[PDB]
Amino acid sequence: MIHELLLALSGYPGSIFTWNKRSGLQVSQDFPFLHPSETSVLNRLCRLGTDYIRFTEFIEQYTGHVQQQQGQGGLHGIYLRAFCTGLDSVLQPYRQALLDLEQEFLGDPHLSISHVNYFLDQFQLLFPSVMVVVEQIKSQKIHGCQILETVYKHSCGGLPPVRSALEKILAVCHGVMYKQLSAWM
């Protein structure tokens, strides 16, 4: 129960936790030996994995996928590519945490899912927050420097961790404009 949860969240979909485009990852939920206790916790855990699949998929889709054949500002463009480059670096300690967790499970073979769900509670708020930024960029077809304000307007929140997280992606997106400005000026 423990270790394909790491398998599912890592981005290789499980035959128990069924990946759908309309239900994300989802437990089979028809076992004659499931209990109401585990249901809520699996539901809490699968949200982060759904968001992670969307994030990694989008980043792989729109960063370095062409040899340049104008493009689209929200589906191509160097600001958008740099946004994805910042985004995967922000996602790194989650991957590190899963790698730590497997060693914990190996050391103690009797362990339950609530222990895991307790540890992963700090991504539980960070991952849904950042989704709406890339959602707005993708839907609203934002082109050029107006991308730079969008994460900037969303770094005004009252959550310090999410604010500090988005600031790095904005800092990555500054450098490309800096690099071109060094030549034009």
Place this chain on the structure above:
Amino acid sequence: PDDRSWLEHHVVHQYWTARPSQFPHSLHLHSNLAAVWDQHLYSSDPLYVPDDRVLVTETQVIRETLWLLSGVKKLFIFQLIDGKVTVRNNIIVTHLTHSCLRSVLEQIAAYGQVVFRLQEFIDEVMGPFRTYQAFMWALYKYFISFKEELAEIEKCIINTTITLAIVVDKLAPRLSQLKVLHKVFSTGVAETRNVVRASHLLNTLYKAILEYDEQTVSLLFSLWVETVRPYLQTVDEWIVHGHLWDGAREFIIQRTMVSFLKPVLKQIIMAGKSMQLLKNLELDDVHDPLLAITFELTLRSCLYPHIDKQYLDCCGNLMQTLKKDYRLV
């Protein structure tokens, strides 16, 4: 057979999955209490009136209730009626004659309702106000550390027996502060304009600290600092940048009040306006070293030098630069 057999043997599956208990009983009244109660009922000639419960041991209930207190929802124990947890009476342990057990689980459910409503509010911001958002994060910050302790305790069950009296008396210094939290949240859910909806809560926070002025007052203070973070930032912005940023006028004064910074507030407004009229011609990181070197009374009177020095500098510089090259005198 071969996995179902292993299930039946080496996993429990006997109340949370409907398969009546085969837990080994070594009877004799301390745990044969249901049967002696039935014989006593028969001697009182009921006649027959048979009750149906699923027969669990005690410890499973303890782990489920600790799960309920941690903040997760939808468990087999405690039927849920309209949103409120309520004790189920279709669950029996042999002794405690089914009436004590009802009372103990009802008390734990009485605490669980208080935990559930707060976590419901926290879940409802995950699916510009910015002060509610700073409030729920501090609530969450309490909750994660609170969950840590109970999650530790539940591990030690697997590795020793633990009873109800242990778990209720262990959580006394937390259920103490939970009652404070029930009172603070009552006025944070009592509400049109976003500025009164925040100031009404924040002023209650400013007032309530004096009521407990050990361990509770530090909780109130640490809750206090992480919730006045937006207003502090906006005031500092109005100081150093000259302009007051408008969020449908989140500040109390129009370009409803709080006591917090009222007795110096005139010096603050006279600071903000003066800075933008000067250009026409770190505060938190100072407040935190003050904690290194009464609570929100005399300590709060040390906050005002930080803003007052800056005020003095701004107004004196403007007055100085107006007296030359336009030379009012």
Place this chain on the structure above:
Amino acid sequence: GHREEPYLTEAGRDAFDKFCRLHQGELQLLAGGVLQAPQPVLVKECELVKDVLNVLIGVVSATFSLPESISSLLSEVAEYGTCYTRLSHFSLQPKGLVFQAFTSGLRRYLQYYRACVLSTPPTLSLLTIGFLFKKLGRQLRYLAELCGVAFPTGVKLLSYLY
């Protein structure tokens, strides 16, 4: 005393061979009795890790050519290897002179990729393999798009690169 008898969610290295046994039986019932899953369990972790390390040199595994969701993981790292071979095969030639120089320049990174594997891992875990060669492997896959495997060659390539 005899104990409180482990929960289902407790212990996911054996209750899990049981969970999967149950779910496999359910699947075979729901199919009709014939669907034939290929190796839904075997073998180990480190042995599979070493075969995967051999894939990055170029020798594909015994299920590929030029737990059941292991197949999902394996296919991610196998295809990487199958494009790796498709670059050295495109660098097999000793035409265009600038193309030969460019090809020998491509070998300088293929040698790097050959040099990192089978030296650096102290026998890492399986998940570390998928994470580690993701930030490097997509960069390798981009070069498959750069090469053909018409195609600009000679100066027509060299201007295209400019």
